[PDB]
Design a protein around this nucleic acid. Structure first.
Lengths: 54, 53, 55
DNA sequence: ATATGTTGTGTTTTA
DNA sequence: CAGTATTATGTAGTCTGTT
DNA sequence: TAACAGACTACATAATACTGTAAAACACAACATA
C-alpha cells in the first residue's frame, strides 16, 4: 500500500517538517523514490531514508 | 519508539551535560547503541550506560 | 465487468474528483481508454492512469 | 588521576 | 523557519448531447 | 421530457519547487577541577 508524504512522515522514527521530507525526495534520499501522483507524492509503505552509523 | 538524547538523559538517575552523553555515544558506552537520525541521536528507552574493559 | 468512471476512480490509490478523471480521459491519460456507452464512459478493470511524456 | 563540565570553533541537518 | 513561484487538482457555472 | 454524464471555461486551492536565513545537534579540542 502507498502513503502520502504526511502519512509516511508520521510513521518514521521521528517525524520532521513536511518541507524537510520534500527536500529529501528532491535530493533522492528516499528508496524507492516516490512518485508525484498529480500534485502529491506517493510513498510505498516500505520506503526509507538511507543513512550510516553503528 | 525512541527517545532523543535529551529525553533519554532526563530519565537517568543522574542527568549529565549534553557533551558528556555525546562522549558516551562516541566511546560506545551506551548499549544498545543509539542510531543517528538526521542531526540527532535516538536512544532506545531502556538503553543503559555501560563501561567495558 | 467494465467499470463506470466513478467505480474506476474509486479503486485507484488516490481517488479524485470526477471532473479531474474526465480531464484525464480527454487527455488520453487512461490506458486502455474508456469506451462510450450511451451517456457514460466505461473502463477496463485493469485500466490505469499513465503518463505519456518522457522527461 | 580521571571523569566531568565549561568554553569555543566548525560541519551538517533541520526549521 | 519565511517568502515567492509553479502546476495539478478542486470547484462552480453554463452548455451539449443522450435516454 | 427530466435526469444525466460529460465538454468547456474561469477561477481558487493545495502540494510542491525553489531560495534564503537562523539555529539545533553534534564532533572536536583545550582547559579547569572536584
Amino acid at each position: 500500500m502507498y502513503l502520502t508524504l504526511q502519512e509516511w512522515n508520521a510513521r518514521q522514527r521521528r517525524p520532521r517538517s513536511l518541507e524537510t521530507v520534500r527536500r529529501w525526495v528532491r535530493e533522492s534520499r528516499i528508496f524507492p523514490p516516490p512518485v508525484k501522483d498529480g500534485r502529491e507524492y506517493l510513498f510505498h509503505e516500505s520506503a526509507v531514508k538511507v543513512d550510516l552509523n553503528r
